[PDB]
Scaffold this motif. Structure first.
Motif, PDB file in Angstrom:
ATOM      1  N   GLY A 125       0.807  -1.196   0.000  1.00  0.00           N
ATOM      2  CA  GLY A 125       0.000   0.000   0.000  1.00  0.00           C
ATOM      3  C   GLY A 125       0.846   1.254   0.000  1.00  0.00           C
ATOM      4  N   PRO A 126       0.201   2.419   0.137  1.00  0.00           N
ATOM      5  CA  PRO A 126      -1.249   2.569   0.249  1.00  0.00           C
ATOM      6  C   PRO A 126      -1.928   2.779  -1.103  1.00  0.00           C
ATOM      7  N   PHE A 127      -3.260   2.766  -1.123  1.00  0.00           N
ATOM      8  CA  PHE A 127      -4.016   2.951  -2.359  1.00  0.00           C
ATOM      9  C   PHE A 127      -5.366   3.559  -2.024  1.00  0.00           C
TER      10      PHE A 127
ATOM     11  N   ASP B  25      -4.000  -1.143   3.901  1.00  0.00           N
ATOM     12  CA  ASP B  25      -3.382  -1.127   2.582  1.00  0.00           C
ATOM     13  C   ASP B  25      -4.248  -0.486   1.511  1.00  0.00           C
ATOM     14  N   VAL B  26      -5.557  -0.371   1.727  1.00  0.00           N
ATOM     15  CA  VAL B  26      -6.503   0.125   0.733  1.00  0.00           C
ATOM     16  C   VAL B  26      -7.543   0.972   1.453  1.00  0.00           C
TER      17      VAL B  26
ATOM     18  N   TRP C 136       0.982   8.700  -1.694  1.00  0.00           N
ATOM     19  CA  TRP C 136      -0.003   7.813  -2.297  1.00  0.00           C
ATOM     20  C   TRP C 136       0.615   7.119  -3.502  1.00  0.00           C
ATOM     21  N   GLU C 137       0.647   5.787  -3.470  1.00  0.00           N
ATOM     22  CA  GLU C 137       1.158   5.045  -4.617  1.00  0.00           C
ATOM     23  C   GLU C 137       0.291   5.290  -5.844  1.00  0.00           C
ATOM     24  N   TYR C 138      -1.019   5.087  -5.709  1.00  0.00           N
ATOM     25  CA  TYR C 138      -2.013   5.476  -6.700  1.00  0.00           C
ATOM     26  C   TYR C 138      -3.117   6.274  -6.025  1.00  0.00           C
TER      27      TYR C 138
ATOM     28  N   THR D  94      -0.072  14.438  -3.133  1.00  0.00           N
ATOM     29  CA  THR D  94       1.184  13.894  -3.623  1.00  0.00           C
ATOM     30  C   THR D  94       0.997  12.424  -3.960  1.00  0.00           C
ATOM     31  N   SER D  95       1.326  12.059  -5.194  1.00  0.00           N
ATOM     32  CA  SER D  95       1.000  10.729  -5.679  1.00  0.00           C
ATOM     33  C   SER D  95       1.946  10.350  -6.804  1.00  0.00           C
ATOM     34  N   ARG D  96       2.169   9.044  -6.948  1.00  0.00           N
ATOM     35  CA  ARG D  96       3.044   8.547  -8.002  1.00  0.00           C
ATOM     36  C   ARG D  96       2.333   8.558  -9.351  1.00  0.00           C
ATOM     37  N   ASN D  97       1.243   7.800  -9.474  1.00  0.00           N
ATOM     38  CA  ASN D  97       0.410   7.820 -10.668  1.00  0.00           C
ATOM     39  C   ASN D  97      -1.050   7.708 -10.244  1.00  0.00           C
TER      40      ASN D  97
END
Ligand SMILES: Nc1ncnc2c1ncn2[C@@H]1O[C@H](COP(=O)(O)OP(=O)(O)O)[C@@H](O)[C@H]1O
Ligand SMILES: [Mg+2]
Length: 275
Positions: free
Chosen positions: A144-146, A195-196, A216-218, A242-245
DNA sequence: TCAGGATGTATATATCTGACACGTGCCTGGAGACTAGGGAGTAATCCCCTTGGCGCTTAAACGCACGTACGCGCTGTCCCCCGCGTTTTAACCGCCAAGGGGATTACTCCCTAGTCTCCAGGCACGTGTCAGATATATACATCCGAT
């Protein structure tokens, strides 16, 4: 019952360890990553050379992206897990088009870009996304996280299915009056015991400040045409995250305009459709 | 009277945003001629206002005395309004659609105002009358308070 061998290699669940990644310690660690932008543009040009139209205008604007353009100019297996059968870590069966959707998701992931899922209603889009997230968990080793922003009606359904076909994942939904919602916040969210996360279009506007303080991963989103306008308060709020994708599970996009589609795309990859 | 609660009031802290600083273009405030008419100074002429008084008529204002009725304090007795718990529902954001309304920013141009020149009808002022409204008396009618 038998897919637990995939769970080997995951770290034990412990909030103290999760706090290392979940909380983003860097107060202003957000910065323009040259490497990621270069990789994105390189792959994008490799697929086709037409994309330079946005790039050249953006280089006409702020020139520290123009030097990125110059860097990408002068310097010039990733095997898809085809999953010919249903993924082992998900207890159940998946249809071949579902499998191809999963492979598209994976292939976009290992390209540092994303892609709007816009399948027709009823073709288990939620199944696609749960399968892909389980792929990240068991194979890619990112539990996570998501964030799973969705409409309030289907929150129970998303939680039910995610607990059904992948019981190992720990997840919850924010809800209730502010007192018990804040109780859950302080107990698990900032406690980093998940995790979600699952929220609603309203709660995201409500509990942004706790949700800001997580790398945030996604940021998954259910039916996305809600975000078709980029002046909507939800769109404005869903930009400081703030996030990756990102991902934009939806039904039919481009319902009454083209600028709509431009903003919808601008959400995923702002550094390309910036103008 | 003293211990028992509920409620601001300070404390410290992370967050949002909207005052504050900076650079540009544009317009308008300032410098400089030129002029004409508004106002300041003068100086007649008539009417009112002032500051001292004086003498006279005649109602009002003041003072004094019963003596009621009413403003005020107490008591009683409702009853109505406040405090508090419990639901629930309406405000308040967020949205979606399309189009109309209203502000600017130019262009254009008619026509309707101001600006003059003459020139006679208004209308204001100074007179000379009458009649509408007092003031007295005078008889009439018409409440009000005590036997
Ligand atoms: N074994 C299965 N394989 C694929 N899809 C399934 C299976 N069992 C159920 N589904 C469907 O997958 C769907 C995922 O939710 P979906 O209908 O796409 O809702 P939404 O359109 O809101 O995402 C469920 O509605 C469910 O009917
Ligand atoms: Mg859906």
């Amino acid at each position: 019952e038998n897919l637990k061998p995939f769970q080997v290699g995951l770290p034990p669940h412990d909030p103290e360890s999760n706090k290392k990644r979940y909380l983003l310690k860097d107060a202003n660690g957000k910065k323009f990553d040259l490497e990621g932008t270069t990789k994105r543009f390189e792959h994008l040009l490799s697929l086709s050379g037409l994309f330079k139209h946005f790039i050249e205008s953006k280089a006409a604007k702020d020139p520290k992206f123009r030097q990125v353009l110059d860097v990408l100019e002068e310097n010039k297996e990733s095997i898809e897990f085809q999953f010919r059968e249903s993924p082992a870590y998900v207890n159940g069966q998946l249809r071949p088009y579902q499998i191809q959707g999963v492979n598209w998701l994976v292939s976009l992931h290992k390209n540092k870009i994303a892609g709007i899922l816009a399948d027709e209603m009823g073709l288990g889009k939620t199944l696609q996304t749960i399968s892909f997230l389980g792929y990240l968990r068991y194979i890619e080793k990112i539990p996570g996280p998501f964030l799973v922003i969705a409409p309030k009606s289907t929150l129970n359904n998303w939680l039910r299915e995610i607990n059904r076909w992948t019981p190992d994942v720990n997840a919850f939904i924010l809800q209730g009056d502010k007192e018990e919602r804040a109780e859950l916040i302080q107990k698990k969210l900032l406690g980093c015991d998940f995790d979600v996360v699952i929220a609603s279009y309203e709660i995201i506007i409500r509990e942004k400040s706790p949700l800001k303080k997580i790398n945030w991963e996604y940021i998954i989103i259910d039916e996305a045409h809600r975000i078709k306008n980029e002046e909507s308060m939800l769109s404005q709020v869903l930009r400081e995250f703030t996030s990756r994708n990102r991902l934009l599970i939806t039904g039919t996009p481009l319902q009454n305009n083209l600028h709509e589609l431009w903003a919808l795309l601008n959400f995923l990859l702002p550094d390309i459709f910036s103008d």
